[PDB]
Design an enzyme around this catalytic site. Structure first.
Site, PDB file in Angstrom:
ATOM      1  N   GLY D  29       0.804  -1.202   0.000  1.00  0.00           N
ATOM      2  CA  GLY D  29       0.000   0.000   0.000  1.00  0.00           C
ATOM      3  C   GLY D  29       0.842   1.258   0.000  1.00  0.00           C
ATOM      4  O   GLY D  29       2.068   1.218  -0.104  1.00  0.00           O
ATOM      5  N   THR D  30       0.143   2.376   0.136  1.00  0.00           N
ATOM      6  CA  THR D  30       0.696   3.697  -0.081  1.00  0.00           C
ATOM      7  C   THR D  30       1.517   4.156   1.120  1.00  0.00           C
ATOM      8  O   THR D  30       1.424   3.610   2.220  1.00  0.00           O
ATOM      9  CB  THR D  30      -0.432   4.681  -0.348  1.00  0.00           C
ATOM     10  OG1 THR D  30      -1.258   4.785   0.815  1.00  0.00           O
ATOM     11  CG2 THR D  30      -1.276   4.180  -1.473  1.00  0.00           C
TER      12      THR D  30
END
Ligand SMILES: Nc1ncnc2c1ncn2[C@@H]1O[C@H](COP(=O)(O)OP(=O)(O)OP(=O)(O)O)[C@@H](O)[C@H]1O
Lengths: 233, 238, 250, 243, 273, 239, 234, 242
Positions: D29-30
């Site tokens: 994820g980010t």
């Protein structure tokens, strides 16, 4: 070769995946297309319909929620219906508790809070479709995207399902253009229609294989199906 | 193993083990004359130190006209009696008459398949002997099993080689066979089927029914050690 | 917050042989030795407190427990599947009988009210059995002394004498010599200890192993006076010293 | 092998590997951070674009739970949002009580046991998310991070996503350079540096930034997103640190 | 190979060394004796001189020790496989030997065979797990009942044997492929009486002897125990230097059986009454 | 059998022997003793990174103004036990009018662990505990728990991966002076014996932050801070 | 209990074979009369058959049943059927029809199909009787799937294949059963092919209007069975 | 070895798509629309002569003016029609007026979806789904004689006409060839018989099948055993002629 992590939902992968979900999202890949876009003032729904034989009537793709909302779906009807009948209560409840009528974007931020309450409990599947939501409020017009994941996003215009990359590509070819449109929905509408001819695997659209229904900063939700769409073909 | 479902050809996986399992258990017989009733059971153990004297295990009673015997778990049967006892006296505060058996079993054993039928719970590792009397069908005798199907009889066994033991009653039983003419068949029915032919009054347990009291009363008589100990000599063991 | 294991944890065999209790009665043997003997003068029990470290108390651990003023009990096998069971019996002697007929019950009627939960630990769903088989002592003015052994299946033996655990059968091979009928209590400790000396490899001191007895009326325990009628606590446990006073006296 | 199939099955090693697989989901994820300034906290996050069709500045990933809080996350978008909807009512059922705002230790003491409850049972999914929160109480400044096994510790800074290895050693390279005290406004510059500095693991793609802080000084210790030139002041700066 | 074959060195046993067994010889000799003693007699009717028979029963019996003596008083041959030796660690060795087997007896009509154990050729099941042994049970049974077996069944009777019965292939038995079976049970007490008369023929003008006074007591299964107790009875006399022997010295030898008659410890599990 | 709390084929519980070993994830050792009219409890406090706020890190809790406890396990598993303590003190005194002892309250939470071994909806907890308190009826005392229910007092004890390194070292001490607890009054002047014993027996030297402390003072329980420890560490100035 | 890919159900492609093991029974639809007939274990010694649960059972004054297959799963239905009988006589004040309770119990054998942890029955049953205030016979047949039919003759049990076709060489629509002596001759001339013994191994029963129920001795059977035991000769 | 609420890697569910061939085991059941009336037809699957086929009822009557015909597994569908009768009558109360068909039939296909998350706030009844499908025919005064089709997957289409069951894949082709706008009623009361006579395993009788029209004038009507027979001769009036 045979992922045993393919059964019930909660089991993560050894890499951070839910193989139920990822194997669900290809459903809409086996489902049809329904596209949509917007100006700063007016937004659109579109849907090819998928017919059974030379005799049957057609499978529907659009439903109104309420006077300032509609939507359109992809893949499955029945698990997708209940969400429509669901949020009607969460759009009546607004207009009776408050009368300060419903803002669109919280609906998605309600809606994402539904499916997640269906993944992490034994029993129950995802509401495995993608769908598109439209409407208008004090903030202008808005379009949305949906995934049975939960991810929902504010877009200018997008597409779904089979054969859709052809129509999907017209928009990046054209996002400079259609955003500056106003009060003139006719030519706007045929943007997608010409653009989704990119998808036609020689089925050559007709009076009745298409359904359109739109909204504006003025218009309540209206459907153009039956025989009124000789206008466009 | 999913108690509910059937075989691939119309049978069950568990319950055929159960009434086959109970064969491991002791013996409990029960007969009838046209005069009186006899019962018997051989305790699974007859070691000496423990309290075989007052060991009332195989033979319980329910009210003042009925007696039974037991075969199966010590416990999973131990609850049915506390259950069915209530269904006897709770017949009475409605109606105040005495209880018949033919309502009891038909209104009891239907509890059994209730746990074969659902819940995923195991059935009851138990079978019974019955005995008693109503004023409408005379003396009586009945039996049961973990399924629920009940069968009237004149003389029956259970447990170890009961199929074998039931033969031993086949030739000798008489229609008008009186009590003291029929009692000796029982322990003689056991005097053969025993593992330990070395036999002890301690090892078994006993019970009776008669109509001994005049004015048509009856007796749920149960017999103590030194009595049946001396009864044992009567047929001439030692 | 969701229950789905409501099936039975229990399984039939082809030939009876209910599985997951027949495995249970290993641990009852793997546990310590403990015993119980009666006599007309009184009744006795005992065990061996296997203090693991050189650090732990033995005061904190109740390898012997009181049930009522006229009952005791003891186990072998596992402990935490014993501690819970006391209170679920104490709360039952009142909530079914003692607040309802005044008097505390005879000994066996209690035993009907421990097997009637021990059973439910098996035939119900989502559960296991208590890996314990324990022992009760008896008294009542209408039926007299008795012992009563229990077991996780739901049965309950009566007895005149027995024992259990990692040295059981040897004792059962022994005590069938030592027992008889012409018995007081003051003798019964010699045999009981003399038994439990042979089946040990560690220390053998009074501050190592606890036991207890069934004496007679002892109003000094009762706390108050004035009523000559009441029957005091026949149950009683011993101290550190009174054990050793027997041991020196061998 | 055969023990790695469901919740609540410990290992001979003494673990349940399933949540340890969750760590690779949140690994997918980010980037996202949040810093303990001298008087409040800061929030900043990565927000990558796939197509131009995604609108800018209508799709925030920060969430608010109440006035004096900001919270973010990374990894599973929905799942990290659920417990917020639990958060937004819990403290509301605590200001209900003694008529005062809620502490931050009250937050995790009312959350950090929740997700635990989704690792006791064989019927639910561990929240495959790592999560941040911060804000102010009467006592002063606070900051915390969560990990999906319930754990949490009070940091001066944190990081998630695939922006781990850059920032962690970088903050090791920061703190010794500036331990004296870092006020609110100044970290809003130095924060947005790091995200431009941490995208290089995924510089195939593009994004746009999103920032929020809360100061006892500036905003009465209330929560207030960024929207203005101050953001544009920082991106003009943060390019230089990578220049 | 002819090692399996019959013997010019017959054993020396006899079917009157075999007390207690009184009826079975009358029930089983005739199929092995009479119509082969008189085929014209049997052929007067000529129903079917059947195929072999079988004997089931526990150990302790001397089913073997019976089968040693029958090879005396024969008029026929008595071959031996030394059971299960026929198989080898290969495939082709199986059927050839069986092919060699029948023909070895075709040349001798008045001649028969012996098995002791068919626990090792029983209950064939296969889903990938099995073995070549199952291959050989067929062809023997095939060449038992085929175009070339009844000519043996014209010439031959046979016998099988084991100690555990119901653990084999029922597809073996077409009754008629085996036309008769029998139990060799454990003995009666009084059946045990004449046994020790056989083997203890060692008393020396002694007295106070009550041979009946031992099957007085026994509840065993074997008859061989009559020897196991007898054989070690004399051991006492053997050690104490006095060749003579009596009842009581002969009686406590059962103390060796005090283990056997009591080695079976018992469980205290009153789960069910 | 190797996934749930049924009885094993032989008759142990494979899902439970694991849980003891689920504690040892941290390489951490703690210690417990009895004062004269006080008590002491300590443990390592590791900090392998630079950015924490060790103001925040802690295993040693505060349940009354009376008692305390410690943990050597995963703290998320601990906090569910931590919270359930604070509850189960209140409901006692609210029903009887006096504070919660230790001997009882372990006998509660020891009853509690059993019905996590007797059902299967539940995950047990891979922790253990050492409760500490004074008692107006029993005096300075402690009690330990396992995840099964075995709970027992200890005149003095410790825990971690390295019990053998020290637990022998303590038993050697009482075989050198031979009494239950120490013959020294002030808690301030006996914690030295603890930290004197750790580093010497088999332990490694410590610094200011490396350790944490709790004391069950008469009618008071509380932790300690930096200089409060550094001062008490400089008792080693004389020895 | 789910759907196979062959349109079938595992557990219910099985269950109805259970009834194909046990006893065998039948009834018919006479000209103006209706009858049943069923099976018993001869050689069951040391027993008195007066009190054993008959394969016949009665539900009202004017209707009866005859199960097969299991025996436990039979006893339950009569009870909750009896309820509906002596309840339907109350709320509506009229007695039952025949199809009503048949329609009812046709529904209960799937209320015990589609749920969690519930087996269907090892039972198949049929009924018979005249409606109140009418004359035309009515009989209905059942099986666990719930599909209730109206067979003019219906048998469930052992050796029943040819029995299922034996009638078709015997019965005639436009030549129905005249009277009881022939219609019961029909009732027995079917069942006896699987009897293979005397009269003791069976039990029968009959209906006529206004609740004219009868049960017939072992001896009455030995009156008529002889007449075809005499006419099984030429 | 699959379950209910679990997708595949291909997305195509197992059980419901397996529930979409159990119908292909069952009988035949056809109805065809004419703008002046609609028909219904059946194949009794009568297995023996002694049987009295008045009792077998593959055809029903919702009201005086609506009827349906169940196919596949006739047992289970006996339940759901009582649902429809409840909603019909219920709608005949709150409004004092017969219901539109599409207001009803959404409900029935809103029932069979109940095996997991039915309509808003639905507790999961129906451990398994309905192994049966059927056809709905009748008038309402908004669209016309709009036939409707239902299948337990939980969707409905509107048709001119088609079929089900055994003769599905083959028979409909003739129907696909031989329907149009301007035909009669009785031509459809007989055209089915040209079809059903194909896919019966025996010569037709008046009792193999049976029929029922539907009319906005009278309403609902089942025919008699004989009044099918008279038109069969009328079919043989063309089968013998041509
Ligand atoms: N009546 C008897 N006459 C002679 N010997 C007997 C008699 N009863 C028992 N035996 C003895 O029994 C022994 C063998 O019998 P047993 O059945 O125990 O084994 P077996 O028959 O050799 O075994 P297997 O049949 O499995 O090869 C012999 O030593 C024999 O002396």
């Amino acid at each position: 070769f045979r992922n045993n992590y393919d059964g019930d939902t909660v089991t993560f992968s050894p890499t951070g995946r839910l193989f139920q979900v990822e194997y669900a999202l290809e459903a809409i890949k086996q489902g049809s297309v329904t596209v949509g876009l917007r100006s700063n003032t007016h937004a659109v729904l579109v849907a090819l319909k998928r017919n059974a034989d030379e005799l049957s009537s057609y499978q529907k793709k659009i439903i109104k929620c309420d006077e300032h909302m509609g939507l359109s779906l992809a893949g499955l009807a029945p698990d997708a219906r209940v969400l429509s009948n669901y949020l009607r209560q969460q759009c009546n409840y607004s207009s009776l508790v408050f009368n300060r009528k419903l803002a669109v974007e919280r609906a998605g931020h309600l809606l994402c809070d539904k499916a997640q309450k269906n993944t992490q409990s034994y029993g129950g599947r995802p509401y495995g479709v993608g769908l598109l939501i439209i409407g208008y409020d004090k903030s202008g017009a808005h379009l949305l995207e949906f995934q049975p994941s939960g991810n929902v996003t504010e877009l200018y215009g997008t597409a779904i399902g089979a054969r859709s990359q052809g129509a999907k590509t017209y928009l990046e070819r054209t996002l400079d253009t259609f955003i500056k449109i106003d009060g003139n929905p006719d030519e706007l509408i045929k943007a997608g229609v010409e653009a989704i001819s990119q998808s036609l695997r020689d089925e050559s659209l007709t009076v009745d294989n298409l359904s359109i229904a739109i909204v504006g900063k003025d218009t309540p939700f209206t459907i153009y199906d039956g025989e009124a769409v000789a206008k466009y073909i | 193993s999913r108690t509910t479902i059937f075989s691939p050809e119309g049978r069950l996986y568990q319950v055929e083990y159960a009434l086959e399992s109970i064969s491991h258990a002791g013996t409990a017989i029960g007969i009838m004359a046209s005069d009186g009733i006899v019962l018997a059971a051989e305790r699974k153990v007859t070691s000496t130190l423990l309290e075989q004297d007052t060991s009332t295990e195989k033979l319980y009673k329910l009210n003042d006209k009925i007696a039974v015997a037991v075969a199966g778990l010590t416990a999973d049967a131990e609850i049915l009696i506390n259950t069915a006892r209530i269904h006897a006296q709770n017949y009475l505060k409605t109606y105040n008459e005495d209880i018949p058996v033919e309502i009891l079993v038909r209104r009891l054993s239907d509890i059994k398949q209730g746990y074969t039928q659902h819940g995923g719970l195991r059935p009851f590792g138990v079978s019974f002997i019955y005995a008693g009397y109503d004023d409408r069908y005379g003396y009586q005798l009945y039996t049961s099993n973990p399924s629920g199907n009940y069968t009237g009889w004149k003389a029956i066994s259970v447990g170890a080689n009961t199929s074998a033991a039931q033969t031993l009653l086949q030739m000798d039983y008489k229609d008008d066979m009186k009590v003291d003419d029929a009692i000796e068949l029982a322990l003689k029915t056991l005097s053969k089927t025993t593992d330990s032919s070395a036999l002890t009054y301690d090892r078994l347990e006993f019970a009776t029914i008669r109509k001994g009291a005049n004015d048509g009363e009856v007796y749920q008589k149960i017999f103590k050690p030194q009595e049946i100990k001396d009864i044992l000599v009567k047929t001439g063991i030692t | 917050m969701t229950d789905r294991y409501s099936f039975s944890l229990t399984t039939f065999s082809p030939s009876g042989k209910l599985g997951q209790i027949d495995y249970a009665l290993t641990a009852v043997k793997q546990g310590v030795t403990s015993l119980g003997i009666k006599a007309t003068n009184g009744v006795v029990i005992a065990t061996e407190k296997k203090s693991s470290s050189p650090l732990a108390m033995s005061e904190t651990l109740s390898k012997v427990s009181l049930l009522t003023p006229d009952i005791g009990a003891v186990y072998s096998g596992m402990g935490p599947d014993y501690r819970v069971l006391v209170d679920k019996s104490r709360k039952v002697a009142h909530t079914s009988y003692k607040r309802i007929y005044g008097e505390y019950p005879p000994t066996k009627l209690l035993v009907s009210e421990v097997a009637k939960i021990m059973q439910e630990a098996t035939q119900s769903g989502g559960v296991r059995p208590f890996g314990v088989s324990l022992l009760i002592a008896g008294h009542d003015e209408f039926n007299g002394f008795s012992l009563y052994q229990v077991d996780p299946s739901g049965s309950y033996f009566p007895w005149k004498a027995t024992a259990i655990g990692k040295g059981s059968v040897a004792a059962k091979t022994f005590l069938e010599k030592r027992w008889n009928d012409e018995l007081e209590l003051e003798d019964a400790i010699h045999i009981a200890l003399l038994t439990l000396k042979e089946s040990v490899e560690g220390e053998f001191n009074g501050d190592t192993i606890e036991l207890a007895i069934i004496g007679d009326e002892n109003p000094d325990l009762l706390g108050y006076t004035g009523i000559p009628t009441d029957k005091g606590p026949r149950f009683r446990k011993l101290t550190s010293q009174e054990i050793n006073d027997r041991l020196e006296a061998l | 092998t055969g023990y790695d199939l469901s919740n609540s099955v410990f290992s001979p090693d003494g673990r349940n590997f399933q949540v340890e697989y969750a760590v690779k989901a949140v690994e997918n994820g980010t980037t996202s951070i949040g810093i303990k300034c001298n008087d409040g906290v800061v929030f900043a996050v990565e927000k990558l674009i796939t197509s131009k069709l995604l609108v800018p500045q209508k799709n925030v990933k920060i969430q608010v739970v109440d006035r004096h809080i900001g919270c973010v996350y990374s990894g599973l978008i929905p799942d990290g949002r659920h417990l917020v909807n639990r958060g937004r009512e819990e403290a509301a059922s605590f200001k209900k009580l003694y008529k005062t705002p809620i502490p931050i230790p009250a937050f995790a003491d009312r959350l950090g046991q929740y997700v635990q409850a989704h690792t006791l049972y064989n019927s639910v999914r561990p929240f495959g998310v790592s999560t941040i929160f911060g804000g102010v109480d009467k006592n002063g400044a606070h900051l915390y991070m969560l990990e999906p096994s319930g754990s949490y510790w009070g940091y001066k800074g944190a990081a998630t996503g695939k922006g781990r290895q850059s920032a962690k050693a970088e903050l090791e390279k920061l703190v010794d350079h500036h331990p004296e005290g870092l006020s609110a406004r100044e970290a809003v510059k130095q924060a947005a540096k790091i995200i431009y500095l941490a995208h290089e693991d995924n510089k195939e793609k593009d994004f746009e930034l999103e920032i929020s802080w809360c100061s006892l000084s500036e905003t009465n210790g209330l929560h207030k997103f960024v929207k203005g030139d101050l953001l544009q002041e920082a991106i003009d700066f943060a390019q230089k640190e990578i220049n | 190979l002819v090692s399996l074959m019959m013997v010019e060195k017959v054993p020396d046993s006899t079917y009157d060394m075999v007390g207690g067994l009184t009826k079975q010889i009358k029930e089983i000799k005739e199929v092995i004796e009479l119509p082969v003693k008189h085929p014209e007699l049997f052929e007067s009717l000529g129903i079917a001189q059947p195929k072999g028979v079988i004997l089931y029963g526990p150990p302790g019996t001397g089913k073997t020790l019976l089968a040693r003596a029958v090879a005396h008083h024969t008029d026929c041959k008595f071959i031996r496989v030394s059971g299960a030796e026929l198989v080898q660690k290969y495939i082709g060795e199986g059927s050839r030997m069986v092919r060699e087997l029948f023909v070895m007896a075709r040349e001798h009509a008045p001649s028969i065979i012996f098995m002791d154990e068919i626990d090792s050729i029983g209950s064939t099941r296969v889903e990938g797990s099995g073995g070549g042994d199952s291959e050989v049970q067929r062809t023997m049974l095939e060449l038992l009942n085929q175009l070339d077996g009844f000519e043996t069944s014209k010439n031959i009777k046979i016998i099988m044997a084991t100690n555990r019965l119901d653990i084999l292939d029922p597809a073996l038995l077409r009754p008629g492929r085996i036309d008769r079976k029998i139990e060799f049970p454990p003995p009666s007490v009084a059946a045990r009486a004449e046994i020790l008369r056989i083997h203890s023929r060692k008393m020396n003008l002694t007295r106070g002897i009550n041979l009946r006074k031992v099957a007085e007591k026994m509840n065993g299964c074997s008859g061989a125990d009559v020897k196991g107790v007898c054989t070690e009875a004399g051991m006492y006399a053997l050690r104490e230097r006095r060749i003579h022997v009596t009842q009581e010295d002969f009686e406590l030898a059962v103390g060796k059986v005090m283990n056997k008659n009591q080695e079976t410890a018992i469980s205290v599990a009153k789960l069910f009454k | 059998d190797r996934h749930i709390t049924i009885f094993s084929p032989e008759g142990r519980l494979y899902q439970v022997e694991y849980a003891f070993k689920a504690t040892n994830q941290t390489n951490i050792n703690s210690l417990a003793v009895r004062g004269k009219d006080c008590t002491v409890v300590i443990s390592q406090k590791k900090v392998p990174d630079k950015l924490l706020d060790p103001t925040t890190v802690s295993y040693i809790f505060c349940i009354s103004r009376t008692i305390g406890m410690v943990v050597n396990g995963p703290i998320p598993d601990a906090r569910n036990a931590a919270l359930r303590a604070k509850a189960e003190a209140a409901e006692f005194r609210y029903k009887y009018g006096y504070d919660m002892p230790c001997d009882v309250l372990a006998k509660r939470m020891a009853n509690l662990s059993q019905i996590y071994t007797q059902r299967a909806y539940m995950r047990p907890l891979g922790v253990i505990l050492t409760f500490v308190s004074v008692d107006e009826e029993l005096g300075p005392s402690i009690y330990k728990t396992d995840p099964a229910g075995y709970y027992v007092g200890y005149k003095a004890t410790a825990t971690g991966p390295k019990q053998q390194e020290i637990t022998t070292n303590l038993e050697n001490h009482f075989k050198k002076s031979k009494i239950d607890h120490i013959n020294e009054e002030s808690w301030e002047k006996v914690v030295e014996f603890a930290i004197t014993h750790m580093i010497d027996a088999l332990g490694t030297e410590f610094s200011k932050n490396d350790l944490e402390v709790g004391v069950a003072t008469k009618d008071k329980f509380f932790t300690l801070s930096a200089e409060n420890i550094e001062e008490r560490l400089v008792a080693i100035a004389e020895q | 209990s789910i759907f196979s890919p062959d349109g079938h159900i595992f557990q219910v492609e099985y269950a109805l074979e259970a009834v194909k093991r046990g006893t065998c029974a039948v009834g018919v639809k006479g000209k103006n009369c209706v009858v049943l007939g069923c099976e018993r274990r001869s050689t069951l010694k040391l027993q008195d058959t007066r009190i054993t649960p008959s394969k016949v059972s009665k539900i009202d004054s004017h209707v009866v049943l005859s199960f097969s297959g299991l025996n436990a799963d039979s006893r339950i239905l009569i009870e909750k059927a009896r309820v509906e009988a002596q309840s339907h006589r109350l709320t509506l004040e009229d007695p039952v029809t025949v199809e009503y309770l048949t329609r009812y119990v046709a529904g209960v054998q799937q209320r015990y199909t589609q749920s969690g942890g519930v087996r269907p029955f090892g039972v198949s049953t049929l009924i018979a009787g005249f409606d109140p205030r009418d004359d035309e016979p009515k009989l209905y047949q059942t099986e666990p799937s719930g599909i209730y039919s109206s067979w003019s003759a219906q048998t469930i049990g052992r050796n029943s294949k040819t029995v299922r076709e034996f009638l078709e060489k015997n019965y005639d629509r436009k030549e129905p059963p005249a009277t009881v002596e022939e219609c019961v001759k029909l009732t027995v001339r079917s069942l006896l092919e699987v009897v293979q013994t005397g009269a003791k191994n069976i039990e029968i029963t009959v209906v006529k209007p206004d609740s004219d129920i009868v049960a017939l001795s072992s001896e009455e059977i030995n009156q008529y069975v002889t007449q075809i035991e005499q006419e099984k000769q030429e | 070895d699959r379950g209910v609420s679990t997708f595949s890697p291909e997305g195509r569910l197992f059980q419901v798509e397996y529930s979409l061939e159990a119908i292909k085991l069952g009988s035949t059941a056809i109805g065809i629309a004419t703008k002046e009336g609609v028909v219904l037809g059946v194949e009794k699957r009568a297995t023996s002569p002694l049987l009295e086929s008045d009792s077998i009822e593959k055809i029903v009557e919702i009201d005086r003016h609506i009827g349906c015909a169940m196919s596949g597994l006739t047992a289970d569908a006996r339940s759901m029609i009582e649902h429809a009768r409840t909603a019909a009558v219920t709608h005949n109360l709150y409004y004092d007026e017969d219901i539109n068909v599409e207001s009803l039939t959404q409900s029935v296909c809103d029932l069979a979806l109940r095996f997991g998350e039915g309509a808003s706030g639905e507790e999961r009844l129906m451990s398994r789904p309905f192994g049966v499908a059927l056809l709905i025919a009748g008038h309402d005064a908004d669209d016309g004689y709009q036939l409707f089709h239902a299948e337990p997957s939980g969707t409905f289409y509107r048709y001119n006409a088609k079929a089900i069951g055994s003769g599905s894949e083959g028979a409909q082709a003739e129907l696909l060839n031989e329907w149009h706008s301007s035909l009669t009623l009785k031509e459809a009361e007989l055209l089915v018989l040209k079809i059903l006579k194909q896919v019966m395993e025996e010569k037709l009788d008046e009792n193999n099948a049976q029929l029922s029209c539907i009319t906005k004038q009278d309403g609902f009507k089942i025919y008699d055993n004989e009044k099918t027979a008279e038109l069969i001769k009328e079919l043989k009036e063309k089968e013998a002629a041509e």
